[PDB]
Scaffold this motif. Structure first.
Motif, PDB file in Angstrom:
ATOM      1  N   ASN A 183      28.896  43.668  38.471  1.00 32.24           N
ATOM      2  CA  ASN A 183      27.570  43.134  37.860  1.00 32.24           C
ATOM      3  C   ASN A 183      27.997  42.766  36.370  1.00 32.24           C
ATOM      4  O   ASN A 183      27.210  41.906  35.953  1.00 32.24           O
ATOM      5  CB  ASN A 183      26.369  43.954  38.074  1.00 32.24           C
TER       6      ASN A 183
ATOM      7  N   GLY B 169      29.143  38.109  41.860  1.00 31.18           N
ATOM      8  CA  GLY B 169      27.997  38.540  42.868  1.00 31.18           C
ATOM      9  C   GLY B 169      27.524  37.423  43.762  1.00 31.18           C
ATOM     10  O   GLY B 169      27.454  36.115  43.205  1.00 31.18           O
TER      11      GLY B 169
ATOM     12  N   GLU C  70      30.711  47.882  42.330  1.00 31.56           N
ATOM     13  CA  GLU C  70      29.589  47.004  42.217  1.00 31.56           C
ATOM     14  C   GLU C  70      28.712  46.899  40.801  1.00 31.56           C
ATOM     15  O   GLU C  70      28.542  45.737  40.287  1.00 31.56           O
ATOM     16  CB  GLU C  70      28.542  47.470  43.223  1.00 31.56           C
TER      17      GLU C  70
HETATM   18 MG    MG Z   1      26.452  42.562  42.340  1.00 29.30          MG
END
Ligand code: MG
Ligand code: ANP
Length: 389
Positions: free
Chosen positions: A62, A140, A58
């Motif tokens: 990002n 995302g 994650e």
């Molecule tokens: Mg994200």
């Protein structure tokens, strides 16, 4: 018996957010290992916790998202630094920081001052992609991933700087303890997340065993190398302060086939599309064909995400299969192929927060994309040679 959960407690006990919360068998789990000066991707035939690996993923996605966001702008992302040492994981990128400003809506919800970076890291269903356009190629989408990293950390530090101020905030005890931020003047510009996962709660030793540490480091290093092939030509990926110089699909294909088929021929293609938005996003392909390969395998980095299932693979396979059948008839079809596919695809929809599978109409590729004939012909020649032998 009918209970209502908050997000935080639900994420600590439910596999739907990040996958299983203890060690399970992860089909196809791979890491990268150094043999002398060579990088070799090898299987990790030990059970691991999917949610733990998702903490790292994650954060990494990002950072790649921000690189894509800034690529056409004056202030670009020039580095993504990933570190893993003594169990501490961090990911830092430059480019514009997360805005250091009061968030009016969150402050009203929480009944105290809440700044934007706290919304980003501590509020579920919150981020800059809630109303994502269909042509956005960031991975995302949900406003969830960074909160999952926080909820699985015994401690975490978010640090971001915007060129005028620096913001440091401790987010501790699996989102239970959000400390007020420290804001200072600064000329720096970056975003950094540093954290210590709840390894023991996720099934690991306290501290990590030698094998756990080695496996996790190898997994992260390979994920960093995948990033290096995906990001733009101005961005360097570092793992533990050293550059990941796997900046092409050819370099990835070599790393995955070094043990099994060294000194092999790498078939290359750039698959291009005929109209916007698809034409903005060429797909880079490198494949190896070998009789030693026992089944078809792909590695797909799509929108910065390591995608294990998608119709883009099927498009490649069906197109090759059609030509193989024809050439073979003149004198199964994909079981000898290893293929790497890296690039952005607009309009895809992920099937869960984990982003294991993308969803799309197969006709998107039929209508818009063209696989170069030279690649198809060379692949077909190699496959048919195997079938005849
Ligand atoms: Mg994200
Ligand atoms: N490394 C980073 N650099 C800059 N902005 C970031 C970074 N990490 C997170 N952000 C911002 O923080 C928001 C929240 O991140 P996150 O919770 O991961 O949600 P998301 O990436 O939008 N969607 P998803 O990851 O699919 O749940 C993002 O939308 C970005 O605006």
């Amino acid at each position: 018996a009918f209970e209502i959960s908050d997000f935080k407690e639900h994420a600590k006990k439910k596999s739907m957010w990040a996958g299983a919360l203890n060690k399970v068998t992860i089909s196809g789990l791979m890491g990268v290992f150094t043999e002398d000066e060579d990088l070799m991707a090898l299987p990790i035939h030990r059970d691991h916790c999917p949610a733990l690996l998702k903490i790292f993923d994650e954060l990494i996605v990002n950072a790649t998202d921000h690189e894509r966001a800034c690529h056409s702008k004056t202030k670009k992302v020039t580095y993504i630094k990933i570190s893993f040492d003594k169990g501490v994981f961090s990911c830092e990128n430059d480019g514009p920081g997360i805005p250091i400003a009061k968030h009016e809506q969150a402050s009203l919800i929480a009944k105290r001052d809440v700044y934007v970076p706290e919304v980003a890291s501590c509020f579920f269903l919150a981020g800059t992609n809630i109303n994502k356009a269909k042509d956005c190629i960031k991975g995302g989408t949900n406003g969830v991933g960074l909160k999952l990293a926080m909820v699985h950390s015994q401690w975490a530090i978010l640090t971001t700087a915007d060129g005028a101020q620096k913001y440091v905030q401790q987010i501790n005890q699996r989102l239970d303890i959000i400390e007020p931020p420290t804001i200072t003047p600064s000329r720096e510009m970056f975003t950094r997340i540093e954290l210590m996962p709840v390894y023991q709660e996720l099934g690991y030793a306290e501290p990590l065993s030698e094998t756990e540490q080695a496996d996790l480091s190898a997994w992260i290093y390979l994920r960093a190398c995948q990033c290096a092939a995906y990001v733009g030509k101005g961005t360097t990926i570092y793992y533990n302060d050293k550059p990941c110089r796997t900046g092409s699909v050819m370099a990835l294909a070599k790393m995955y086939t070094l043990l099994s088929a060294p000194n092999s021929t790498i078939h290359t293609a750039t698959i291009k599309a005929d109209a916007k938005p698809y034409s903005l996003h060429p797909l880079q392909v490198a494949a190896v064909v070998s009789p030693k390969f026992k089944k078809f395998e792909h590695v797909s980095i799509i929108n910065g995400v390591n995608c294990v299932k998608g119709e883009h693979v099927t498009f490649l396979k069906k197109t090759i299969n059609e030509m193989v059948i024809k050439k073979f008839q003149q004198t199964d079809s994909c079981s000898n192929i290893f293929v790497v596919i890296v690039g952005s695809i607009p309009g895809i929809e992920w099937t869960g927060q984990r982003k294991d599978e993308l969803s799309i109409a197969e006709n998107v590729f039929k209508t818009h994309y063209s696989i170069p004939s030279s690649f198809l012909t060379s692949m077909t020649r190699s496959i048919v040679d195997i079938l005849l032998q």
